[model samples]
Target: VIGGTNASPGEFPWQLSQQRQSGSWSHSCGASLLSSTSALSASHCVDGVLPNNIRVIAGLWQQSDTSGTQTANVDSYTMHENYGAGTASYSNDIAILHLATSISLGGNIQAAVLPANNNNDYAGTTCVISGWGRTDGTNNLPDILQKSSIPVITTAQCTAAMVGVGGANIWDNHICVQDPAGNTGACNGDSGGPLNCPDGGTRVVGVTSWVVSSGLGACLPDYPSVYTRVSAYLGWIGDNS
Candidate 1:
């Protein structure tokens, strides 16, 4: 995470880490544990990648410490049919990975609640985001998970904010959140993570997607961090996983 603090074990039990098994086995993108047999992530993270190259790690808090981690192999993955690739267009940037084996649920690993279908309005609220992403615009990921709460803003406000970036259009498929004061939000390596909100049961409202940064798309201060609205794809998630 960009400017968040370290999260303790089981604090965000639904947190997940994806590792590319082709070569490197280190932490890659962030995901949210949805069920014993599946999890959700950003499509761009594994867009052109194959299933054999993906590995799911759950019940994990520390990237450097895996004492309580449970690893699972991915049997298949289904990306959104309208998933548009490229940073220029991150439309419907969500994916579901079916685990070869169900993940064992425990205090440190559990399922996340999702919003109802076609109920994707989360403006004017605060939500929690966590991941092992770059802390300061670098490739180096922190050993511990970093988390922070950001205010969810409407598409209009987000579009206004993007005026400085040549007015990148904000859509319903996207959810925007940021600290008005800046310096606190999501970043690289945080992709595909959950934008957990505290609504009743703390539902997973968004999935960390792309960000508009003045820096190298790192944890730059000010720019709005965009996410894929989880509520927008409930039917798809249900039919697939």
Candidate 2:
């Protein structure tokens, strides 16, 4: 089994916030706090799920934790045109959320750091991954945000590992990370979550996306988890933003 990590908790720290109606509750798959009023997460996470059906919660880890509650309405959302379900290559895996109101920064709620430069050469580097994902592939979604650290594997190694797992090649635009020693990694509900290098605190490098078939079904060791290399798409993201 993979281990987990921790960052200080706050109210609704992630992008997706839970919604309650009648006597039941439903939650968004994932979300990241980008700005006080804006968020970043995967389009597929919100696909078929309406914007109004969700709410933005900043500085939060667990659903049951209300210590850092600051509800923000959705102002707008933008999904990449190439995003879709099924194909590995076609997963654009990005989205922006405009909040109904700007959140205050001084408190536990603060904007997440975006990828600084498109260097795209962090192979073999250790990075952090966090989410409200399941502890194991077969487990239910975690009620609290969980974290782990994994190293970035080169595109060559990533491709070699993924060649037979999927009919498509793992693009250079994406990266993979997993522990050969069964140390740590991301699981379900970790999609679009940030993967960061820790040499100097932390630097955003990849956005968690798909795990290998063995990794996906069982969170296996040596089965690298893949992500979108934000560095490769930095220019395009700048132009679009």
Candidate 3:
């Protein structure tokens, strides 16, 4: 939902806040703790953002409380070669951030699982999406991590709903999810958050991307939230990271 229930501490230990350096440090987007030395986020989130000006907050639960948290300065990051900001479908929207210093992998922080290569069974399955983004179209950001269980929609099914609204495009590499009745889904600032599925484990099947924005807001009703399917780019991620 920009919506979901409250995520308890250690419930989403793999999730992290991608904070920008603005003196006090504010969260700009969500990310996954990929490893002790790196994280995964949306390219658009850090498109113009400099590495030194960004910080990764891991093991974080509350936005206001940094207790039991770990912070790292960015060494560099690689946005996918095909990443295009102006593209409607947001194809290849994923990025990997390299931390300047590594954080300990134990305690409240742990790495997220990556989906199996070429796995396409995400559709029709349910997954958990956790983020600190707004709970709706309004800029109502939550202090604590918010989570929701949404069913993954097949590309054809999503295309049907999306096409009726705005002639939207859905690529094969894009994974779509939504509450059938709508009124609950991801909103602004949630970009790069994980769509963790249970394929062979609790793997992050996709990274948050754009939402169907023709006749309805993402959190409104009927429009599906799109993501960059993680399995589609296993080769690229390995080469870059």
Candidate 4:
């Protein structure tokens, strides 16, 4: 879902997972090459997704329309133990995928920067979100991954904005970001994509999650979108991943 339309010109950092029963493949909302044999992604992306039917492509910038590319098999998948669907605790929406084999560091494949501990990240911060999600909430999914910079919002402000829908106290396991103007942001198919920011260096801080809808429009910037902050679960990640 977090596929890219432009991958550093000729570079593609996109990876994909195929649905088991449907036999249809979907791009990762966001991915980081931890090592040749491992990568980080959203738990929901691989949730309920069978391993054998799933495939991971590292050097990809386009979907189904792969003109030139290479595909790899997923050796294993690990989702956070506390993570599960529900409103009670949407805090642990993270997952990792281990490749059957290591990928060569060449072509559109390369490692992404990782977040460092003790770094502070919050609202007003500028970051880019890339994905193969719909151009607009109602538009069709883009063939290539696309990216846009968005500003991080304060938890208080986020809570206030979402008070009516899911309430303002939705900060237990999430962070919020929005466009100053109600125009830009991650939409459908963007779930599990990275809410990346510059923390000492560029690193992923949030995993794009649900958006607040008020019968107006989907992914409307006025309404803050929620993200699962990686910082809050660093210990869990270290233990499991």
Candidate 5:
């Protein structure tokens, strides 16, 4: 789960819950609806999983409360070919899921706008991250959607800090974020969620990827979280989707 506060219903129309089917459905990660039948998420979230085992939930605030929610079956999914699973370097960690059928739009359901290609002009701006991640430092996923505001840290600053701790690599196609106070950051279930910024309007700037690990390999609060820069892969998304 991620560190954040409870979000209001319909607060993030484009927010989505990516779930896996076991005995019952369970959230694996967050995602953003890019169209009626397509969504954007982290490659790691769908890694090693079949499209039939995946479900996408939209217009959902509370996890168990299905009122006003729309569900979709995954027809297919494409993870970046360069994504190296189990590798320390989380390069090209993005993916797109094609829904079996189109979902109805209105009310709490909508598509998130994609930012212009190669846009990195949002550094130092405050962006909002929303998901159904854990609230506390536990494995429990929150019932309601959670939201947190974090400053977009420059790649240079983020790379330096990460390099000092370990040989963490922050690529040019990555967006870095941090809460300097160390109180807020993304965690397990928050992966693949949108890091949206308001530059004239809300736009998906990043797709949550990996959290910086402590020396002991746990999520470190002092370190910043990295996301796949959405703008860097606009062409890939357009051609694939």
Candidate 6:
């Protein structure tokens, strides 16, 4: 991610690297472990992709450091029924993956807690997001996991920021966060990572979805990034898990 530093090992225990297997495993997106056999990610990360081609790696701090890491085959996945690819709006962008084998949790691996239902009151709250996403405009993925803290922006502010761009498609089921100084934000390959916020305790508040684009069609650092409000889909997560 832009303007972030290398994350310490075990700092984000529930963070996962969602990879696509081709000639070699390649970073595709970020994900969060929800249970021994379930993972939460953005729907677009697995849409139209074969389950056999996807793999989940947990307890990983560096992309090449596989020691003590747990790997699992994706047994199956279900994208939100309302998710539409290539659409202007990215509503219902959440997805859950069932692993072929249960993940053994311990020291550097654990499950993240989901936010309580209808808890959309995180405005101005600062949260941490970690991923192996691009480090710059050249689309370079980091070998070490990156971490950044961003503030939650009000929906009204986010809507106004998108004025003539896309007419503010931010829905009740969505969240917006940003670094008002025009730095330190999520980028490509970071989608599906958890927005870890602390209310009474740590909880997964949002799922990284999309970045706001500038007039030149490039990701605007100053604009807030939109996420799928995880609290809005508690029922769907429970029913599907």
Judging by TM-score against the true structure, name the best candidate. Answer: 6
Each model's lDDT: 0.84, 0.65, 0.82, 0.65, 0.86, 0.87
Give residue 105's lDDT in candidate 1 (0 to 100).
93
lDDT of 3 by residue, 83-201 (tens): 87344566689899999998898677889888767847578899988889878656667998888889898888877777765546777788889897676688776788999887877
lDDT comparing candidate 5 with the true structure: 0.86
Candidate 6 Cα deviation (angstroms), residue 126: 0.9
Question: Which residue runs of candidate 6 sit more than 4 Å off their true CA positions?
Answer: 85-88, 214-218
- For residues 48-94, write the lDDT of model 6, one tens digit per residue: 99999999999999998899999998999999988864444687999
Overall local distance difference test of candidate 4: 0.65
Give per-residue CA lDDT, model 2, range 63-123, as digits (tens). 7876756777676677777775445664677777667788777466666565666655788
What's the lDDT for residue 139 in model 3? 62
lDDT of 4 by residue, 126-202 (tens): 87777667666465777666777778887778777776664334765677877777677667767766676877766
Q: Ten residues in a row with the worst lDDT in model 3?
A: 212-221
Ranking by TM-score: 6, 5, 1, 3, 2, 4
Clash pairs for candidate 1? none
Rank candidates, lDDT, best first: 6, 5, 1, 3, 4, 2
Q: What is candidate 3's CA lDDT for residue 17?
A: 89
Between prediction 1 and prediction 6, the one with superior TM-score is 6
- For model 1, residues 60-97, the per-residue Cα lDDT tens digits are 87777789789998888999888874344588888999
Judging by lDDT against the true structure, name the best candidate.
6
TM-score of every model? 0.94, 0.83, 0.92, 0.82, 0.94, 0.95
